[PDB]
Amino acid sequence: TARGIVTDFAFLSPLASSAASRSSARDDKLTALLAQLDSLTRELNVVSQQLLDLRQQVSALKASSPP
């Protein structure tokens, strides 16, 4: 099966094609950038939280051996 002929008046309208291309570019930008930024922010938050906890543990260990 295959189903698409909707490009009829798209061919009949160059402006519609240009607007569709702009919409595709904007969708690419939005989707890709937002997904990447969200994943990066999640990873950075998790790593920062773990780093803070490890820093606390190291501070405690340093304090518990007063040379």
């Binding site: 002929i5 909707v6 009829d8 008046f9 798209a10 009949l12 309208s13 519609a16």
Partner: protein, 51 residues
Amino acid sequence: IRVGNNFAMEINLNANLWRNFLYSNIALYLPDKLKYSPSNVKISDNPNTYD
């Protein structure tokens, strides 16, 4: 006086009636994906309006 047959024009009737009936009562109800947007005429951006 007319020489030869009279001037006349032809049209298929039953085919025209059937074509009108079919086009209206089926084509005007296909899913919007097969439909397109017209040219040089303003149309509502909301797909759910009568317009």
